[PDB]
C-alpha cells in the first residue's frame, strides 16, 4: 500500500505539483480552442479532432457544452474528464437557480468548479482532471464574459485567449490583432478564422475541421448558437478573399 | 525507501518520534526553574528583524491562572497542545469544581503523544508527532512544580530544566547553579544570566520573555519595565 501509492497530492522539492504540470502537458496536446470577447457578444472556435469519414454527428457540437441558459463552455484535454466536469457544472448552476431563483453569475460557476479541481490537487490521492476550460457567458453584473480554468483549479478572466495545441502562437496573434473596446462579433469572427487558419496544422481549413459558437444578447434573452457549416464556409472564403487582396499590394 | 510513520528501528525506536526530538534542537532555548517561592520560565524570542513586532512572539502562554507553559520547536504544533491543555483544565474545573494539578494537565497533554497513524484511524487524526518540547510551570497543593515534556510523550518533573538548541550548555550551567533553596530572585537572575550566555543577539527587554508563578500570585508575564529592572542588575 505504501509501495503502490504514487503520491499525487504532494510537493516536489522545487515547490511544484508534478501531476498538475503533467496535466498541463496533456492539455498542450489537445485540440486548439480559442475564445474572443466583443461588445455585442462573445465567441468560441475550436479545432475538431473528431474528423474522420465515418463519424455520424449526433450531437449539437463536439467541444462546446451548454451549461446554463446564459452560459456555455468549451474544453481541452481528456474528454471523459470533461464530461465529469461539465455534469458537475450543470449541477452547480441549477443548484444556484434552485436557491436564488435567478441565473448564476459566471464567475461563481467558474469558482465553484475550480474549487473541485483544487480539491483534487490537495487531497485524496487521485489524479487531477487533465482538462482546461474556456467559459463564455453573460450576466446582469458584468455582462459578457470570457474565463479560463486550468487543472490546478486556477482561473482567470480574459478579453481573448486560447487553449490547447499551439496556444502560445494563438495568444501572440491575438495580442497583435485584438481591439480593446472596439471589438464586434463580425470582426471577432474574422479574427477567429484567421488565428484558427494559422494555428491549425492542416492548412486550407475546411468547416469539417472547425467548430464555431457565439453567445449574444437578443431582446432580453440570451442566445447561444453553433454556426452552421454554410456560414463557416462564408467566413473562410471571406478570409481567403481578404488574404489574396492584401497580397496584391507589393 | 518509504516506510510507515509507525515503524520500529531494529534498535527499538520509532523513527518519527526520534526525528521529532531532532526537530526540537532547532527551537529557541527555554529555561524553567522550580523553587519553593514559585516557578520561573524564560525563553529567548529570536527576532529575525527589527521590523518584526516582538510582542507578537509568545513562546510563553497561560494554560490557566496557576499553570504556565514555555514551548520550543514548531510553535504551530504547540498551539494545538496548548489549546487541548486549556480545554482540559477547564473541563476538570467544570466537572469537579477544583483546579487541575500540574501533573494531571501534563499527563493529559502527554496523552496526545503517540496518537498518529495512517490506516485504521479517523480521517482527521494526526499524521506525525508533535515537533515540540514543553515546560509546564505551576503551583498546586504539592506546591511549585515544573514538568518537561517531549514528543515521546514521556513527561517528567524537573527542578531546573532547559529545552531548545542550547539545551546542553544551559542545562550544565543550570546544574552548576541550582539548589533546592534558591529564591525566586536568584532563579530569575540565574535564568537571565545563562540565557545571555547562550543567546546569539544581545540580551535586552524586547528579546526574551519571562514569567513566574508563585503560590499567592497568578501566572505573571513580566512587562518591559519589569524586565528592565532585572536586566539592570546584570
Amino acid at each position: 500500500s505504501r509501495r503502490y501509492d504514487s503520491r499525487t497530492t504532494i510537493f516536489s522539492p522545487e515547490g511544484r505539483l508534478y501531476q498538475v504540470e503533467y496535466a498541463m502537458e496533456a492539455i498542450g496536446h489537445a485540440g486548439t480552442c480559442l475564445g474572443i470577447l466583443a461588445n455585442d457578444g462573445v465567441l468560441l472556435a475550436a479545432e475538431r479532432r473528431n474528423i474522420h469519414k465515418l463519424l455520424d454527428e449526433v450531437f449539437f457540437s463536439e467541444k462546446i457544452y451548454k451549461l446554463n441558459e446564459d452560459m456555455a463552455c468549451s474544453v481541452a484535454g481528456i474528454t471523459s474528464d470533461a464530461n465529469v466536469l461539465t455534469n458537475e457544472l450543470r449541477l452547480i448552476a441549477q443548484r444556484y437557480l434552485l436557491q436564488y431563483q435567478e441565473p448564476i453569475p459566471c464567475e461563481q460557476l467558474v469558482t465553484a468548479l475550480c474549487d473541485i479541481k483544487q480539491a483534487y490537487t490537495q487531497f485524496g490521492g487521485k489524479r487531477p482532471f487533465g482538462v482546461s476550460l474556456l467559459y463564455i457567458g453573460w450576466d446582469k453584473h458584468y455582462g459578457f464574459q470570457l474565463y479560463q480554468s486550468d487543472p490546478s483549479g486556477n482561473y482567470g478572466g480574459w478579453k481573448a485567449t486560447c487553449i490547447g495545441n499551439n496556444s502560445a502562437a494563438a495568444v501572440s496573434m491575438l495580442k497583435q490583432d485584438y481591439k480593446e473596446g472596439e471589438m464586434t462579433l463580425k470582426s471577432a469572427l474574422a479574427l477567429a478564422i484567421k488565428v484558427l487558419n494559422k494555428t491549425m496544422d492542416v492548412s486550407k481549413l475546411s468547416a469539417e475541421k472547425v467548430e464555431i459558437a457565439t453567445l449574444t444578447r437578443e431582446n432580453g434573452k440570451t442566445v447561444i448558437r453553433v454556426l452552421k457549416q454554410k456560414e463557416v464556409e462564408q467566413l473562410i472564403k471571406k478570409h481567403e478573399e481578404e488574404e489574396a487582396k492584401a497580397e496584391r499590394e507589393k | 525507501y518509504d516506510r510507515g510513520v509507525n515503524t520500529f528501528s531494529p534498535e527499538g525506536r520509532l523513527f518519527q518520534v526520534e526525528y521529532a526530538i531532532e526537530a526540537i534542537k532547532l527551537g529557541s532555548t527555554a529555561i524553567g526553574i522550580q523553587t519553593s517561592e514559585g516557578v520561573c520560565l524564560a525563553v529567548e524570542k529570536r527576532i529575525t528583524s527589527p521590523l518584526m513586532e516582538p510582542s507578537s512572539i509568545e513562546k510563553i502562554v497561560e494554560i490557566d491562572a496557576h499553570i504556565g507553559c514555555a514551548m520550543s520547536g514548531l510553535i504551530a504544533d504547540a498551539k494545538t497542545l496548548i489549546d487541548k491543555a486549556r480545554v482540559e483544565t477547564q473541563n476538570h474545573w467544570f466537572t469537579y469544581n477544583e483546579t487541575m494539578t500540574v501533573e494531571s494537565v501534563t499527563q493529559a497533554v502527554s496523552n496526545l503523544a503517540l496518537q498518529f497513524g495512517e490506516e485504521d484511524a479517523d480521517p482527521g487524526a494526526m499524521s506525525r508527532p508533535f515537533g515540540v518540547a514543553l515546560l509546564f510551570g505551576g503551583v498546586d497543593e504539592k506546591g511549585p512544580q515544573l514538568f518537561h515534556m517531549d514528543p515521546s510523550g514521556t513527561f517528567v518533573q524537573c527542578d531546573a530544566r532547559a529545552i531548545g538548541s542550547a539545551s546542553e550548555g544551559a542545562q550544565s550551567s543550570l546544574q552548576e547553579v541550582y539548589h533546592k533553596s534558591m529564591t525566586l530572585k536568584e532563579a530569575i537572575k540565574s535564568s537571565l544570566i545563562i540565557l545571555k550566555q547562550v543567546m546569539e543577539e544581545k540580551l535586552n527587554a524586547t528579546n526574551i520573555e519571562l514569567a513566574t508563578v508563585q503560590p499567592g500570585q497568578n501566572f505573571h508575564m513580566f512587562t518591559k519595565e519589569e524586565l528592565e529592572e532585572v536586566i539592570k542588575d546584570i
Binding site: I10, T111, K117, Q122 | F15, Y19, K25, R128
Partner: protein, 243 residues
C-alpha cells in the same frame, strides 16, 4: 478515504513538504505591506500584464471583511480556498459574538487552518503566505503574516514572494517615523519598495489601502502613475540636485 501521512519528519528533524510549500511561496509575485498611522498599504508586484487579460479576475488583494483585507503569494487556488474559509469564519464570528473581527483573530484562524493541513492524513500543505492587514476597533492599525507552517507574527512592514529578501532589506533601511507620517508618504514608501523588485513599470504595481473605519480602496493606474511620478521627481530633486 485517503489516509496517508504526506507531511512527516525527516531524519534531521525537518518537515520537507512544508519546505517545498515555502518554495512554492518563494515563486510567488512579490507582495509587501506597510503599516501607517491612519493608513495601511499593501502592494503586490507582477500582475502578469498580459493586456488581453481582465485585471479584476486576477487580483491578489482580497477583502475578508469590511475591517480586514489580505494579500498573498504562492498558489492562487490554495489562496482562494484559505481566503473563502477565512471569510466564512469572519462572519460566523459576528454571528456568535456581536463584536466584529480583529485582525489577530482571523490571522489565528488562517494560521491554524494551514497548520491543520500540515498534520492531517491525506492532505498537502497550502503553498501560500499571506499578509493580513486591518484596523481593529479602538483604531490601532495591524499587519500580520502567516506561513505554510502555520506560524504567524505581527510586522511593521514586510514582504513575501519573489525577491522578498531585497524588498525586506530596503524596508528595513527605509521604514522610519518620518516616512509613513502622511498617507501620501506611506503609499510612497510602498511604491518605492515595490519599484526595487518590479520589472520597472508602474502598470505592474497594484496598491490597495485601508484607512480608519473606511472600506478598502484599490488604486487605479492613473493615481499609481501619479505617485510613481512624484517618486521619480523626488528621485531627481533630492538625488539629482546633490550627486
Amino acid at each position: 478515504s485517503y489516509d496517508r501521512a504526506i507531511t512527516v519528519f525527516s531524519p534531521d528533524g525537518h518537515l520537507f513538504q512544508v519546505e517545498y510549500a515555502q518554495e512554492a511561496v518563494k515563486k510567488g509575485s512579490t507582495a509587501v505591506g506597510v503599516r501607517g498611522r491612519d493608513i495601511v498599504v499593501l502592494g503586490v508586484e507582477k500582475k502578469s500584464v498580459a493586456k488581453l487579460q481582465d485585471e479584476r479576475t486576477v487580483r491578489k488583494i482580497c477583502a475578508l471583511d469590511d475591517n480586514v483585507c489580505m494579500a498573498f503569494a504562492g498558489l492562487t487556488a490554495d489562496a482562494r480556498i484559505v481566503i473563502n474559509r477565512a471569510r466564512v469564519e469572519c462572519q460566523s464570528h459576528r454571528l456568535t459574538v456581536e463584536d466584529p473581527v480583529t485582525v489577530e483573530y482571523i490571522t489565528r484562524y488562517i494560521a491554524s487552518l494551514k497548520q491543520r493541513y500540515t498534520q492531517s492524513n491525506g492532505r498537502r500543505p497550502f503553498g501560500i503566505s499571506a499578509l493580513i492587514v486591518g484596523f481593529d476597533f479602538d483604531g490601532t492599525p495591524r499587519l500580520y503574516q502567516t506561513d505554510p507552517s502555520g506560524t504567524y507574527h505581527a510586522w511593521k512592514a514586510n514582504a513575501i514572494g519573489r525577491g522578498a529578501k531585497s524588498v525586506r532589506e530596503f524596508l528595513e533601511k527605509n521604514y522610519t517615523d518620518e516616512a509613513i507620517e502622511t498617507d501620501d508618504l506611506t503609499i510612497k514608501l510602498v511604491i518605492k519598495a515595490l519599484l526595487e523588485v518590479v520589472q520597472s513599470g508602474g502598470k505592474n504595481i497594484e496598491l490597495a489601502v485601508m484607512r480608519r473605519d473606511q472600506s478598502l480602496k484599490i488604486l487605479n493606474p492613473e493615481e499609481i502613475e501619479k505617485y510613481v511620478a512624484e517618486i521619480e521627481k523626488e528621485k531627481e530633486e533630492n538625488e539629482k540636485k546633490k550627486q
